[PDB]
């Protein structure tokens, strides 16, 4: 096999979505074999697997256009251990959900919430499936602050293309 090795998928950039920024950003990483910038998604293929593998862990989590950047290995996996919550109109936050989660016999490695809007929805992930299914069945349909919160897994693996 010679597929996955040099290709990093970036998030959608604003009106400033051009190779100019991609080069000025991914520049200090290695000889970019090629670059792609489309309204909605970006891609960058390095001439060296190392340069790519690094840029993926470097660029990922960066800042640009007053927004958090995101980069990954242009590719798709299978199965996961994360779930999303709904009907949770509360402030908690990652710290809150993480506190109750760990206290409820549920260890998580990643957490996220949505405070920007009043949708009242969050998302958590566990290191193992056991905790996922357990926490999902233990959290599914629960009364809290006079509100019934529910948890449901949501897998969104990029199209096969």
Experimental technique, in short, is: NMR
The β-bridge partners of 39 are none
Domain map (residue ranges) of the chain: 8-73, 82-153
CATH code reported for the domain at 8-73? 3.30.70.330
Domain 82-153 adopts which CATH fold? Alpha-Beta Plaits (3.30.70)
CA end-to-end span of the chain, whole Å?
18
The answer to whether domain 8-73 and domain 82-153 are alike in fold is yes
Please give the sequence-ordered ranges of beta strands (E in DSSP) within the chain, or none if there are none.
8-10, 32-38, 41-46, 63-64, 67-68, 71-73, 82-86, 110-113, 122-125, 142-144, 147-152
Asked if 41 contacts 71 with a C-beta cutoff of 8 angstroms, the reply is no
């Amino acid at each position: 096999g010679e597929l996955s090795n040099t290709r990093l998928f970036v998030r959608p950039f604003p009106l400033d979505v051009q190779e100019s920024e991609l080069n000025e950003i991914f520049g200090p990483f290695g000889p970019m074999k090629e670059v792609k910038i489309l309204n909605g998604f970006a891609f960058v293929e390095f001439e060296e697997a190392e340069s790519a593998a690094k840029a993926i862990e470097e660029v990922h989590g960066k800042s640009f256009a007053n927004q958090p950047l995101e980069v990954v290995y242009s590719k798709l996996p299978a199965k996961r251990y994360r779930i999303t919550m709904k009907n949770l109109p509360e402030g908690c936050s990652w710290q809150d959900l993480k506190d109750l989660a760990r206290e409820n016999s549920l260890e998580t490695t990643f957490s996220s919430v949505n405070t920007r809007d009043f949708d009242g929805t969050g998302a958590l992930e566990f290191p193992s499936e056991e905790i996922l299914v357990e926490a999902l069945e233990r959290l599914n349909n629960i009364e809290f602050r006079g509100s019934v919160i529910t948890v449901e897994r949501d897998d969104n693996p990029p199209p096969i293309r």
